[PDB]
Each structure stands twice: as C-alpha cells, then as structure tokens.
C-alpha cells in the first residue's frame, strides 16, 4: 500500500502518454470496470486518494479474434459489412453495454489482402536495405 | 450425427449439426410431420422471431408430408410471425410438405434443380356405424376445401384447376412447380 | 429437438426449445394427453406460479385428447393456482384437448386463424359381471356429466345443447368454436 | 420433461428436483417396487436434510403392489415429518390407501379429483393346497388394508368390508364425507 | 430417479438418491436379485469396506427373491468383510430375499410394522437325459441343503422345522418373522 | 463410438470419431441412403461450406445404396456448395452410391484398388387401380431417365450405353469404373 | 451407483486393480476384459491384479482370449469365485495365478465338456465335431497342466455336469484355498 | 463399459476403456464385420493417420468375419495409409477377421498362443430369375478370385492350395497358422 499502482504512478509521471491495454478478452471482464471512471471523466483515484488525470492521454485497446472464432461466425446456407456487423455484434457479447459506450469509436480491421502482405514485404525489405546500406551492404530483392 | 464445437472467450458451445444450422435462422423439416415434428417446428419459429423479429428464417423441406392438422400448425405460425419464412425444397415436398413449400414468404420460395414435389388430395380414413361415416367424409371433405382454396390463394392457379389436378398424385419437377406457381424459382448453382 | 445457446451478462446458457419457451413461461401441450404428461404439466404450472405469482401464464394445446382424470388435473391446477393461463390452439384441440382450451382465462383463449377444435362425449369401457358394467357405466355417465357442466358453465352454453352437441364427434372451426363461445377471439397475423 | 433455471441460484434442475427441493413428492405412476423403492429414498432424504419441516406427496396413480404400497405406509409413518397428501387427479387401490394415511389435517384432494377403494386383485394357481395359501394370504392382506382405513377413516371395519366389496368410485366431497381427506382445497 | 442438492452448507454437490444414500453407507436392495443387481451389492460392500473398517453398513431389503447363487455371492460378501451389516425389510423379503435379511448381524436385523417375509424352498428345473435330470436333483438338493444349514445356524431353529416350514410357500408377519428368528426387532415409530 | 480427446491451445474439448473427422472436412457415408442420413449429409456439407468456401471437401462412399430422392438431395447440395467434392469409394457403392461417387468433382473423383461399384435402374413398385400403376410407372420412368441423363453427362458415355449397361446390375471393379468414366483415377498406394 | 471422491462403482474398483466378469463371457465382454488388463498392466506392472469371477458359462473363444491375456501380461492375477463359475467361468478361475486362486466359502463352481452344433451335409458335421473335439483336447490339457489332475480323471470328471463345493474345489486344484473370514 | 482415469500435466482426463485404449493407437474389431463396423474402423484409421503419420498402428481382431465387402474396405483402407499396422488375433479370426489378419505389415502379424483362425470360402446368395442369380454367382465367383489373389500374394501360398483348402472350413492353430504363413510369429508370454 506504501506503493502506488504501477499505471496510476507511470501516468501521474507521463501525463501525455499512449496507454496500450493489450489483449483484453483475456484478462477477466471485470477488471475493465476500472476503466469506467478513466472513459468518462479522465480521473482514476489510486488507493492512497490521489486523483491522477488521464484527461491527456490516448487509451488503445486491442481485442483478437482467432481465426476458429471469426469462421464459426460464418453464415451456413444455400446462397465486409458483414464481417463487421457480426464482429461488433458479438463483441457485445462480452462487454458490459456501459462500458463500450464509453468508447469513443470501435474499428474493426480487416483480414490482410494478399497485395498488402506484398507492401508489407517490400516495406520491411526496404528498412532491412536501409540498415545494410548504412554499414555499406548495397541489398536489392527482386 | 456429429457435433460442431464453437471456442469463444466465455465458454464452449456444443451443437449437434442442426443446432448449429439453427444458429444461422435455418429450420430443417426432414421427416414426416407428425404432432412432436410440428410442435418442434413451432417452438422453432417463435424463439426465431424472439431472437430477431426482423430478419428473414429459411425452412429447408425434405419430408413425405404428414398429418394435415400438424401442417396447418405450421402454416398458421409461419403466417402469425412478422419475419418472412424463404421455403427450400431439398429433395422432396410430398403432400402436406408441398403445401408448406408453398406457403414461404412471396418471392422467397424455392427448389433445389431437381428436387421434386408432389400434391394430392389429403388422404384419411373412417370405421363407423353411417352416421360416423358420414361425419368423416364431411370433415375430411371441409379439409380437402381448406388446402384448395389455400393453394388457389398462394400459387394464383383457379381452385376448380387445384380440385382437377389433386385428384390423382401429381408429380412435378422444380420447373414445372415454378410454372405451377408452388415456388418462385430454381436455385441455380 | 434442437439446441438454443442464448448469450447472457450473467454468462451463456443452453436451453432445449422446450425449456426455453417455459423461461418465457410458455407450457406447449403437444401430446396425448397420459397421467405423466399430466404430472409434468401441473409440475410446471406450479413451478411458473412459485416464480412470479402475477405474470399470466400461456398454455399452447396441441393434442388428440387423453385420460380425462389427467385433464381434470390440468383442469384444476389452472384453477388453482393464481396467474391467469393463457390458452391458444394450434393444431388441434380434441377431447379433453379442448376442454383445456375452454379452461382458459376469461379473455385469454385463442386459436390460430385454421386450428380445428372437437368435443364428443368420453370413451371408455366395462368388462366383466352385469353388476361391474353397471358400476362403469355409472362412471362414465357422471364423468359426462362433469364435463357437460362444466364447459356449459364456461362456455356459457345451455348444457342440453352441450348434452346434444357433443353426442357424436363434432368438429368446430376457429369462427364456429368462437361463436360456440370456446375461445374468445381467433388470432389475427401481424 | 423440461430443465428448469432458478436465478438466484443460477442453478439448473429438472422439474421434479426442483419440486423436490421445495419438500414436494411426486407419486405420478403406478406403484411398483422400484417406484416405492425411490419413494422411500426421497422420504428418507427429505427427513435428514430437515426434521421437522412437512412433506408433501402428490398422489395421481391408479394403484398397485400392495407391498409396495405398505412399504410407503410404514416409511410415512416412521418418519418424524408430517406427510401430506394431495390427490391431483386420481387415487385409486393403493393410491387411495396412500392418500388417507397423510397426516390429520393435511389430507386434501382438487374440487374435482376422484378417489376409489376396493378389494385387492392378486391369483392363485397350481395345487389345490398352494391355492388355500394364496387365498389365505390375499385374505390376510385384505383384513389388514380393512384394519388400517378404519383406524385412519374411524369408518367401521364392516362399512369398510360393505363398501369395498365393488369398485367404489368417491368424489372429492363423498371422500370428504368418507373421512379420507380432511378438506377438499378451494381456489382463490 | 429424481436428483438431489445436498451439502447445504456449502450446496455444490448434486447427488443421485441412491449414491446420497450411500454416501450415508445405504445399500438398497430394491429388485429381484439376478447376477449383475448381486454384482453391484458386491461391488458396493467392498466399496464401503474399503472407505471404513469401523462403522456398520445398512442394507435395505425389498425383493422377491432371485438366483441363489447370487444370493449366496451376497451372503457371502456379508461374512467376508469386517463392518456389521444391519438389514432392514422394507416392504417384502421372499426366497432369497429374507435368507438375505437373516443373514445380517445378530441384534441389527429389523422390519417394518407391517413388512412381509415369505420363505420357501429353492426352485429349479430339469430338462434332458436320466442322468441329467438325476444330477440337476441332487444339485437342486444339496443347495437346499445348504439353505437350511445356514437358515438353523443363522435363527436358532431346528433344521428339521425349517425343513417342514419351508415345504410350501410360508407367509410370515413382521412379528412372526422375529419369533421365527429371522428379524431381532420390530422397527416401531416415534 | 471411440472419443478423442484431441485438442489445439486449450486441449479441453473431446469429440467423438465423427466430429474429430468434419473438423478435417472428412465426411462419412457407410449407410444405407435414408432421409435422414441424407438430411445430415446435407446438413453437414452446408456447415463446410460456412466454415471455409475454398478448402476442398473429403466425402468417403460406401452405400449398398438408398432412397433415390435423398441421393438428388445430396447430388444437389454437392453441386450448390462453393467447395470441391472428392468423392472416395471404399468399400461398394451401389445404386444411389455410385450416382453419388460419380457426383463427386471433375478430377476428384476416386476408388480404392478393389472397391466395387455396381449401376442398376431404380428399383420401386405400384399398388391399387390401373390408374394409379400406370401414374406410378410414369413416374419411376421419368426418375430412371433423369438418373441416365445425369450419368450421361458426368460420365461422358451416350445415354443409350447406359441405358443399355443399367438393364441388370452391373457389377464393375475400380478399373472398369475408370474406364466407364465414373471414376477419374484408382488410389495405388504408397 | 455413482460413489463420490465421482466413479461410477466399477471405474473406482478398477482403480483399485478389482476387474468384474460378472456376466455371460459373450465376446464383447472378454474384448472389455482384455482392454482393462492390458491398461492395468500398463499402469503398473508388477502390481497384482484381481479377478472377480461369477459367470454361468460363455464362448471357448472369448474364454481362451481371456486366458491368454492373463498368461501373457507381466503381473499376477488373482482370481476369487464369488458366486459361481461354470463351464469357462471355472477354466478362467483355474487359471490364476498358482497359489492366488480362491473361492468364497459357499461359491460353487462346475466343470463340463464344451456345447456346440452342427448342420447340413455329412462333411461339414464330421468337420465340426472335429473341430469340438480338438477344442476339447485343448481344455483337457489346461486343466491338466493348472490343477495337475490326470488328462484322463478330467476326461471322466467332465463328461457330465459336475458340481463342486469350495472344499471339493481346493481338493480338485481348481483354487488354492478357501477364503476365511476375518 | 467402464472408465479409465489418468493425470496428465495439463490436468486430468476421463476415458472409456476403448478410447484410452485408441490414445495408444490401438484399434480394437471385437465384432461382427459390418458397414457400421467397417465406417467405425476406416475412420479411426483415418484420424490415426492424420495424428501421426509415421507411427505404427495395432489391430487386434477378435471377430467371426461378416460382410466380403466391409472387410474389402478396411483392407483398402489399411493399405492406402501410410502407417504401419500391426494386427494381433486376440482369439478368433474367421473368414473376414482372418483375411484383415493377413492384411497387417510384413512381420508385425501376429496371434495369441492359442487363438484360432478359420479360413473359407465367403457366403452369398441369388435370388430370382435366371439371369439375375448368373449374375449373382458370376459377382461370388470374382469375389472368391480376388479373396484367392491377395491371400496368395500375401502369404505366398499357391493360389491353387488356397482354393483347395478354402473349399470347407478350415480351423488353424497359431502355429499351423503361422505355417501357413498367415501370421509370421506367435506371441511368446513373458
Ligand atoms: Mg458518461
């Protein structure tokens, strides 16, 4: 107790700071009720009754769906939006209603396209090239 | 029949393969329609309608028919609930399961490319003294009025060409039921 | 019998169809009418009146008839209990089928627009000695007689017309059970 | 039989467990050895789990073993619990028995159940001596069936005797009037 | 079989009503005793042995009788293990069902007010050859026989009058059934 | 029916042998073709369908064969589904069997060295008045000519070889069936 | 029976080694015995093993399967009588473990040549009956290696039913002793 | 059927014996040869091979045979896959069961001491006109071909001395059945 949180202390030293809450399926559904109190006023009040504003921080939150997962969801019958509007119906399904209407906007991101894993690869061969070059290593993929 | 297991982050969802196709709004009729079959097939429709009032639910239809009473329970619910039922013929809708057939949601009713259906005047029976003859023949009679004039509603065929046509069993292919007016049209692949 | 999984906040449930529609306190009757289907009815009738004492209480009838003891036992757990039962035909209601259905709540009973309603007098049976077939006989007309009062107490109906009415099978539309005072409107599509 | 969810538990139970937990009985069937068997085990269980609240047996059978029927009787009687019964439908042969060895007082029938009373069925077959001892026996069991409802009734062993020589159908009033229940249960 | 809800100071377990009552070290004997219900008893005693050398075992009687070696198997099983067994008639103990009731502790052998217990010698058949009817007789006899013994050894009677009382179907009260010597005491009410 | 505990990440589920073989899009036909089998069937091949439109689909054949409508209901669906069929006769298939084998995608269609397969015209039969024969004749004809049109065109041979190969049954090995054309190659083994 | 620790009341015993035949030795039967013994003989293998033995009789085949199973895995199996074992119920208890086989005090146990039949023609009644009478001759010989009686007392001993007591068991070499009680 | 229990460091598991029994790769036929049976063996060797694709596989056959054309179809099955499988006659292999125990690898074929294998001709039957029971007998007669071939191939006995002495019932001991090159050792206890 004679310890702060770990979170609360990092943003009360870092106030304008990018806060990444990773995975959050995994994590048990109640432990986002803190978040509540943080979405709608920016304060969290640590445990000694400090109140450390988050009013100028960006909260991310990242949330997978595996691939068995988004496939059972999948429409079974004779004959994105789609994608979309069943991912965000089910992600209903684990929250808590007042705790995504906190949420400022939920994005759903798409299923890599074949041509973007040929950007993506060019794009990492191209800093890989950079970093070469700078010891003098002269690289060039076909 | 096998059993389709869904992973997600509350918990494991165990379906046999038509509850999983529930899950998709589908209902199977795929056996004789007796009064568990009908009853089933009721329960079905209503928890469909609770689960989303407004989105469509597809009745695939494989069934040599059946009672006439547990088909009209059937009738009357798909016509009660507001979403509209899209009929599909799988194989065959004999008797009671082409009048079902006939009674999905207009423009939504359909047959696989050669599936077949067939109609026919309700069949029944009777064992009395003449009395209790007579009051079977009248009401299996009022029944046979009943799905005619059904029929002449929702296909636009004249009822006296139902009456003729019924008579004997009739056989029809997918084309020729789309020209019958039972569905509306061939699924093609 | 399918499965429904219905995701809820306090977790994710399986429910059979039929259990799922006693959640919404619906009861579906949809078989000859025994004692242990007469048990599990009254069963769950009062399960439903434990849960909430005031929440009306719909019972679906799709039955060829039965035992008539086991419908007097539906019969007098309706009465019983407090919530009012809701009856609707779907199918068929026939014998003590539609006795059960006239056993609805004032108001409360309904059948689909081409559902089919029919009332004869009970079947029944006497073997043995003169003095036994007498004593069966007996029974059976005071089992009539039962029933005759009662839907004429329900149906508002003269009970010789009830008497007369229900001598041979005799089979009702929804419009002719309703002006027969059975059921109390025929239900409309939405 | 459908799955009930009670919420304040969240917990899932099948009808008759959960007619159970209340202390509710249900006796839906005819009475055989291994329907009395479970209906002693549930009495007996029910007297653990708590010694003096009532039970409740809901009785709608057409009969039975006569030996099963006893084997209840004497399990209602041992236990400290007062056993009610409730006829639902029918209570007929044993199913009657059953219904007046409830508790003075906690013996009711539905406006319009039946209850009926008669002489054993049983048979004899084989020698002329092994048919003495059946009729023997079915006549001991009689005079103790007799024996038991005019203690229960306090109805005369010879009305008793009289009156159930022929299958003797009794409304809920007649069985009111014959003291086999104590009341016939009025609706609100 | 109805399932019940039972360590109420904590209220997780479910139970069956059979395995609750041999969580409480109840064996029900409850049919006719054939081979695989005299397997289970077996397979149970040897359960609550193992679970505790100490405390006494109930078994419930209720049958008609059965195979008499798998009454023996039974029997048998009884001697064999360390704990008392009290047996309790609840409603009949016929043949093998009240040899079996017998064959419990001294002085923890008991009956209902108005239990039954019938005893009777062993029946057989014989089908074929001479010699083969002669030895399925001699078998049939030597395990009266061994009836009898146990049956003089285990009440005190004279084998001669168990020998005559068994010569037909003999039905014994409650009370008879504890001068006969089969049962200690009468199980009376509170 | 043998289960497998078989499971990725968690490693909690089980499944028994049949569902273990869908999660592969392995499908099993050893039955005589019914309604049922062929609703499942059906059904089956729809949910491979959802769960990838592109991966191509096992379909294992060893019918002695079955209801000719509940073979047009599969042939159907197997031409409706997005997905490649292979169709992989093992043991026989006859009547309805190898109408499904032949089903079974341009290129994929398999046998095992010594599977059989046997063609033959429908089976059926007709009761009651000349009438209702004569319809009944009409109709199991115009189903045979509707079969030889289907194996005409997937097979490649004329109609009237086939009409003429399907007058008895036909009994053809692996070889001979790959030659007809219902078949595209045998399986040699490793 | 469910017991709670929860087992169904084999499943606990079979933790605990007991393996039940308590049923006609048909063919799936012996395929169930089989399988526990060789999981049992996995999960320890010098442990001993318990066979509880109360059938009327059953198939030769499903018999000498069993039989072989014993002979072949690693650990001693014990076999008890616990009600009656006849025709391959009595061969499987003589087949115990020497020294482990025992029988309760009033079990009975019988010993007779093997039942069979045959139809048809001439040949194949004469190949049939040769083929029961070698199954004979391998049943003689058994019991005459595990009870060490002569081939030629068995032979007479089984040519009708023969009724043995517990004592006339142990004399015979069918089971080593008779189990007290205690 | 009873249950297995077993710890493992993920938790603890509950098998029936059979499934435990296949975790091992162990394949048990103790039934009649059937398309049931066959569908459940075909897929077990399936899931077998997909599991692990080098490790071998053990059929341990205890059946009297049944159906030509479902033990065709493990045997195909049993070829086509690439794992080795072992087959063990467990006590009888008769007609089909000793053909599938012909079927297992070179030198990994095996019996009990004194298990019994037979070896006959496969039954039928023709029923109808002329030309139908021709075809039918044409159809056993290349049934029994193929049965010869691959018994010949694969014991390396002579065609010729198989049909010779496949003629009757043939009863073989584990050594003349290694003799006979069925099986190529008997498993000696230890
Ligand atoms: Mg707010």
């Given at each position: 107790h004679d310890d702060?949180?770990?979170?609360?202390?990092?943003?009360?030293?870092?106030?304008?700071?990018?806060?990444?809450?990773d995975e959050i399926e995994k994590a048990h559904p109640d432990v986002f009720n803190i978040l509540l109190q943080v979405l709608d006023d920016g304060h969290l009040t640590d445990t000694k009754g400090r109140t450390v504003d988050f009013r100028n921080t960006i909260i991310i939150m990242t949330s997978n769906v595996g691939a068995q997962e988004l496939q059972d969801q999948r429409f079974a019958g004779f004959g994105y939006e789609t994608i979309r509007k069943t991912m965000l119906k089910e992600l209903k399904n684990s929250?808590?209603?007042?705790?995504?209407?906190?949420?400022?906007?939920?994005?759903?991101?798409?299923?890599?396209?074949?041509?973007?894993?040929?950007?993506?690869?060019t794009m990492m061969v191209n800093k890989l090239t950079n970093r070469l070059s700078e010891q003098n290593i002269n690289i060039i993929v076909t | 029949?096998?059993?389709?297991?869904?992973?997600?982050?509350?918990?494991?969802?165990?379906?046999?393969?038509?509850?999983?196709?529930?899950?998709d709004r589908i209902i199977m009729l795929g056996s004789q329609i007796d009064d568990n079959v009908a009853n089933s097939i009721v329960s079905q429709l209503l928890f469909?309608?609770?689960q989303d009032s407004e989105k469509d639910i597809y009745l695939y239809i494989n069934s040599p028919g059946g009672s006439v009473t547990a088909g009209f329970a059937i009738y009357d619910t798909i016509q009660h609930i507001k979403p509209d039922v899209q009929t599909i013929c799988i194989g065959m809708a004999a008797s009671m399961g082409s009048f079902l057939l006939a009674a999905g949601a207009k423009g939504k009713?359909?047959?696989?490319?050669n599936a077949e259906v067939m109609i026919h005047q309700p069949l029944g029976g009777a064992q009395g003294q003449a009395t209790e003859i007579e009051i079977a023949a009248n009401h299996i009679l009022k029944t046979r009025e009943k799905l005619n004039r059904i029929l002449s509603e929702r296909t636009g065929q004249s009822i006296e060409k139902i009456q003729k046509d019924t008579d004997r069993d009739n056989f029809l292919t997918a084309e020729e039921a789309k020209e019958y007016g039972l569905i509306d049209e061939v699924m093609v692949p």
């Amino acid at each position: 107790h004679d310890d702060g949180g770990q979170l609360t202390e990092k943003v009360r030293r870092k106030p304008y700071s990018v806060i990444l809450f990773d995975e959050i399926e995994k994590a048990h559904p109640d432990v986002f009720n803190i978040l509540l109190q943080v979405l709608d006023d920016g304060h969290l009040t640590d445990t000694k009754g400090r109140t450390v504003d988050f009013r100028n921080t960006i909260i991310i939150m990242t949330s997978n769906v595996g691939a068995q997962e988004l496939q059972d969801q999948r429409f079974a019958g004779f004959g994105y939006e789609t994608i979309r509007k069943t991912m965000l119906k089910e992600l209903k399904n684990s929250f808590r209603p007042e705790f995504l209407n906190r949420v400022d906007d939920i994005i759903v991101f798409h299923k890599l396209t074949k041509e973007e894993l040929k950007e993506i690869v060019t794009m990492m061969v191209n800093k890989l090239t950079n970093r070469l070059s700078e010891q003098n290593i002269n690289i060039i993929v076909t | 029949i096998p059993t389709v297991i869904e992973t997600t982050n509350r918990g494991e969802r165990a379906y046999d393969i038509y509850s999983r196709l529930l899950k998709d709004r589908i209902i199977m009729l795929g056996s004789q329609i007796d009064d568990n079959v009908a009853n089933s097939i009721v329960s079905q429709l209503l928890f469909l309608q609770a689960q989303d009032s407004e989105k469509d639910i597809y009745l695939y239809i494989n069934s040599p028919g059946g009672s006439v009473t547990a088909g009209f329970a059937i009738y009357d619910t798909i016509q009660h609930i507001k979403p509209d039922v899209q009929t599909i013929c799988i194989g065959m809708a004999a008797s009671m399961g082409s009048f079902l057939l006939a009674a999905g949601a207009k423009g939504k009713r359909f047959a696989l490319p050669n599936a077949e259906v067939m109609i026919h005047q309700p069949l029944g029976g009777a064992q009395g003294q003449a009395t209790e003859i007579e009051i079977a023949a009248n009401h299996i009679l009022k029944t046979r009025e009943k799905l005619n004039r059904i029929l002449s509603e929702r296909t636009g065929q004249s009822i006296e060409k139902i009456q003729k046509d019924t008579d004997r069993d009739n056989f029809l292919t997918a084309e020729e039921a789309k020209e019958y007016g039972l569905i509306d049209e061939v699924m093609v692949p």
